């Protein structure tokens, strides 16, 4: 097969600037790449064809370049339209593999998140499943690390992480961490806390709950 | 490469399924099926494994597994009778074609063909020529085997009465000119003495 790497997955840009997205190939595709744009939760669209040639229905801001192994998309002015996910696909020999994908996020000032610790549910205490909810609202950049520390010891393998998409108004993010602990596990621990590592945060701020 | 092995003829009752197999020596790829009405160019009914082109009714369905392919004609109609050929692509990128199968739908009741013998003619004897004439008429279905007992036999042809007919011509020298003709239509064997 042909390996397909897109660099970097997360690319940050402001409105009206220039954006480069690079698709790198293993062998030489002979100028037969196709660039696709996917808006969130909707069908992907054909953006750039035969490497350089532009497909009908796309304005002039989108362009392609390069041949052989390196291929790039240059966008002249980034509109609100087009802030989405971009994919590249190979068309030399079967199979038509897709790249990892590149996500375009609106550039914004570095804002630290707000740490909210949701205590264990009183109704869910007798249900049989005990959960601890950590909520981070208004966090920028998308990358953040949440560590579930129980009794001063980090817990791993029992956490589910969810991320909210960029808000259409302020362009922020939300992060939710759920720690799954049984009734015996919930009772055994003494102090449960979550440690948040963010670019805005100077030190890891941890909020603890008392059983 | 050897041609794909196919049954010579298949008999199916009207409104009842038809099964044709295309087991072959390493087809290795997808098997296409073709339909040939006599006197007409072959047309495609099944391509790849079980795809159907436009203009082909749903009654044609296909399958492929291992080294065998099958055309399933569910509820065949009388007008459908034709020769079905299966083709595939070998490793050398050269097409290979199958022998073919005839869909003998039993539209009419089965009947034993009538055979008329023909001894040598007086003119042929005077001219030193011998011709054993075996005319098999009123055959159903149109598939008869002609044998000579002591030889060019025409292929079966549809008769004006809807009964298959055929002729068997045997050449013998005037010196060598009893002669018997054997006819086998469907299991039964018909023998005529001359």
């Amino acid at each position: 097969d042909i390996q397909m790497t897109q660099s970097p997955s997360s690319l940050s840009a402001s409105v009206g600037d220039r954006v480069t997205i690079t698709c790198r190939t293993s062998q030489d595709v002979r100028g037969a790449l196709a660039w696709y744009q996917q808006k969130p939760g909707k069908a992907p669209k054909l953006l750039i064809f035969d490497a350089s040639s532009l497909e009908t229905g796309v304005p002039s801001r989108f362009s392609g370049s390069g041949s052989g192994t390196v291929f790039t998309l240059t966008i002249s002015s980034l509109q609100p339209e087009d802030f989405a996910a971009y994919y590249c696909q190979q068309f030399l020999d079967f199979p038509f593999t897709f790249g990892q994908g590149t996500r375009l996020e609106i550039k914004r000032t570095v804002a630290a998140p707000s740490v909210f610790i949701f205590p264990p549910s009183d109704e869910q205490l007798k249900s049989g499943t005990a959960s601890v909810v950590c909520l981070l609202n208004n966090f920028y950049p998308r990358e953040a690390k949440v560590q579930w520390k129980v009794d001063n010891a980090l817990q791993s393998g029992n956490s589910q992480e969810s991320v909210t998409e960029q808000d259409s108004k302020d362009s922020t993010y939300s992060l939710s961490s759920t720690l799954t602990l049984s009734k015996a596990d919930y009772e055994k621990h003494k102090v449960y806390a979550c440690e948040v590592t963010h670019q805005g945060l100077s030190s890891p701020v941890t909020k603890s709950f008392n059983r | 490469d050897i041609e794909l092995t196919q049954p010579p003829s298949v008999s199916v009752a009207p409104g009842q399924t038809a099964r044709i197999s295309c087991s072959g020596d390493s087809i290795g790829t997808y098997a296409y099926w073709y339909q040939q009405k006599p006197g007409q160019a072959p047309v495609l009914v099944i391509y790849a494994d079980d795809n159907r082109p436009s203009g082909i009714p749903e009654r044609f369905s296909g399958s492929n597994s291992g080294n065998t392919a099958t055309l399933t004609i569910s509820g065949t109609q009388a007008e459908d009778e034709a020769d079905y050929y299966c083709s595939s692509w070998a490793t050398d990128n050269a097409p290979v074609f199958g022998g073919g199968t005839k869909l003998t739908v039993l539209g009419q009741p089965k009947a034993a063909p009538s055979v008329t013998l023909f001894p040598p003619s007086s003119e042929e004897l005077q001219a030193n020529k011998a011709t054993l004439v075996c005319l098999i008429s009123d055959f159903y279905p149109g598939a008869v085997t002609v044998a000579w007992k002591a030889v060019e036999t025409t292929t079966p042809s549809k008769q004006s009465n809807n009964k298959y007919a055929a002729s068997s011509y045997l050449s013998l020298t005037p010196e060598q000119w009893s002669y018997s003709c054997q006819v086998t239509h469907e299991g039964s064997t018909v023998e005529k003495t001359v």
């Binding site: 199979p95 897709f98 249900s127 589910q160 969810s162 | 495609l44």
Partner: protein, 222 residues
């Protein structure tokens, strides 16, 4: 214009056959190549199968991940493309797209792109049955956090309303998470002033359409 629709997507237990149909209208189906692209929720796009037109033999061929389990067929008379999957697995839970591979020139064997994409249908592979949502209050222990935890959601898409739909600003609905058991987990976040926390009656409305179950929960300080 050119329209592609899909069907056959639903809940299927592991190891059971399911057939998707791609109805094609607005353009000629005989001479166009059809490909299926799947997108796992959250993950990237994955290319599943490709079948060439009738003019080029209709050579079906698939990626290494689905070879031996996915068979693709097409009928030109009813302009419909079929994808059949046997030995279905939990990793195949995704959204499947029907794509038309446009030829290089008018008609050529070199394919340059997938031009028109269908809206897509959701194929879910799971063992659990339809379970009603479970509402767990998350009481607020400047801006306070009030929310409800949705646990044990089965075979579904759910709607969360804050203040019976009155509170629209500051409502953050997290994406669904596939729990280990087989149910979905959802979270709702409401940010309100601390003083207003004890005044407004924060009412959460959760509707589980597949189960026809409506759950209402109240978030109050503990």
């Amino acid at each position: 214009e050119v329209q592609l629709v899909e069907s056959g997507g639903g809940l299927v237990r592991p190891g059971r056959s399911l057939r998707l149909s791609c109805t094609v209208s607005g353009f000629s189906f005989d001479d166009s190549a059809m490909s299926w692209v799947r997108q796992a929720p959250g993950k990237g796009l994955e290319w599943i199968s490709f079948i060439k037109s009738k003019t080029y033999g209709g050579t079906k061929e698939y990626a290494a991940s689905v070879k031996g389990r996915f068979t693709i067929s097409r009928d030109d008379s009813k302009n419909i493309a079929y994808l059949q999957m046997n030995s279905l697995k939990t990793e195949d839970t995704a959204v499947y797209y029907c794509t038309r591979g446009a030829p290089y020139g008018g008609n050529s064997d070199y394919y340059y792109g997938l031009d028109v994409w269908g809206q897509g249908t959701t194929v879910t592979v799971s063992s659990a049955s339809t379970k009603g949502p479970s509402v767990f209050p998350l009481a607020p222990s400047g801006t306070a956090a009030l929310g409800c935890l949705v646990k044990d959601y089965f075979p579904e898409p759910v709607t969360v309303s804050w203040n019976s739909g009155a509170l629209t600003s500051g409502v953050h609905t997290f994406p669904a998470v596939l729990q280990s058991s087989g149910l979905y987990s959802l979270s709702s976040v409401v940010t309100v002033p601390s003083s207003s926390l004890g005044t407004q009656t924060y009412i959460c409305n959760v509707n589980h359409k597949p189960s026809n179950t409506k759950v209402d929960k109240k978030v109050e300080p503990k």
